[PDB]
UniProtKB/Swiss-Prot annotation, chain A:
The SWIRM domain may act as an anchor site for a histone tail. Component of a histone demethylase complex with RCOR1. Component of a RCOR/GFI/KDM1A/HDAC complex. Interacts directly with GFI1 and GFI1B. Interacts with INSM1 (via N-terminus). Component of a BHC histone deacetylase complex that contains HDAC1, HDAC2, HMG20B, KDM1A, RCOR1 and PHF21A. The BHC complex may also contain ZMYM2, ZNF217, ZMYM3, GSE1 and GTF2I. In the complex, RCOR1/CoREST strongly enhances the demethylase activity and protects it from the proteasome while PHF21A/BHC80 inhibits the demethylase activity. Interacts with the androgen receptor (AR). Belongs to the flavin monoamine oxidase family. The chain holds residues 805 to 836 of 852 of the full protein. This is Lysine-specific histone demethylase 1A. It comes from the Eukaryota. FAD binds at residues 6-7. Ubiquitously expressed. Induction: Down-regulated during neural differentiation in neuroblastoma cancer. Histone demethylase that can demethylate both 'Lys-4' (H3K4me) and 'Lys-9' (H3K9me) of histone H3, thereby acting as a coactivator or a corepressor, depending on the context. Acts by oxidizing the substrate by FAD to generate the corresponding imine that is subsequently hydrolyzed. Acts as a corepressor by mediating demethylation of H3K4me, a specific tag for epigenetic transcriptional activation. Demethylates both mono- (H3K4me1) and di-methylated (H3K4me2) H3K4me. May play a role in the repression of neuronal genes. It is linked to Cleft palate, psychomotor retardation, and distinctive facial features: A syndrome characterized by cleft palate, developmental delay, psychomotor retardation, and facial dysmorphic features including a prominent forehead, slightly arched eyebrows, elongated palpebral fissures, a wide nasal bridge, thin lips, and widely spaced teeth. Cleft palate is a congenital fissure of the soft and/or hard palate, due to faulty fusion. ACTH-independent macronodular adrenal hyperplasia 3: A form of macronodular adrenal hyperplasia, a rare adrenal defect characterized by multiple, bilateral, non-pigmented, benign, adrenocortical nodules. It results in excessive production of cortisol leading to ACTH-independent Cushing syndrome. Clinical manifestations of Cushing syndrome include facial and truncal obesity, abdominal striae, muscular weakness, osteoporosis, arterial hypertension, diabetes. AIMAH3 affected individuals have low fasting cortisol and ACTH, but excess cortisol is secreted after eating. Acetylated by KAT8 in epithelial but not in mesenchymal cells, thereby regulating the epithelial-to-mesenchymal transition. Acetylation by KAT8 reduces KDM1A association with nucleosomes, thereby decreasing histone H3 demethylation, leading to transcription activatio of target genes.
Amino acid sequence: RNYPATVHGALLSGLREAGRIADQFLGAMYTL
Amino acid sequence: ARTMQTARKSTGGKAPHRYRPGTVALREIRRYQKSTELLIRKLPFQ
Ligand SMILES: Cc1cc2nc3c(=O)[nH]c(=O)nc-3n(C[C@H](O)[C@H](O)[C@H](O)COP(=O)(O)OP(=O)(O)OC[C@H]3O[C@@H](n4cnc5c(N)ncnc54)[C@H](O)[C@@H]3O)c2cc1C
């Protein structure tokens, strides 16, 4: 949302979804 | 948006009460010019 149609925007979206998937399928040990 | 403008960046859109001296004096002038009561005290005068 904050950086659309840019390179850094897609870069952060990749980091975002990679963190979303890892917390989903590997578990989050930092939230406890 | 404007984040893609590399040249010729478009800058259009974003960034108590006191009375004045002399008033009470004149009002006193109006007050005593209408009355006729004595102004000097009676006992100090006597
Ligand atoms: C003309 C132009 C100029 C740009 N200029 C700038 C600029 O000055 N600064 C800036 O920061 N950003 C700029 N960008 C944006 C930048 O290019 C993008 O952010 C980035 O390159 C694309 O990232 P992405 O991986 O999300 O998209 P993509 O890399 O397009 O991700 C889609 C990928 O999937 C593939 N694919 C597509 N269809 C299929 C299919 N059916 N099956 C399998 N694979 C498929 C594609 O080949 C591609 O590899 C520009 C983009 C364009 C088009």
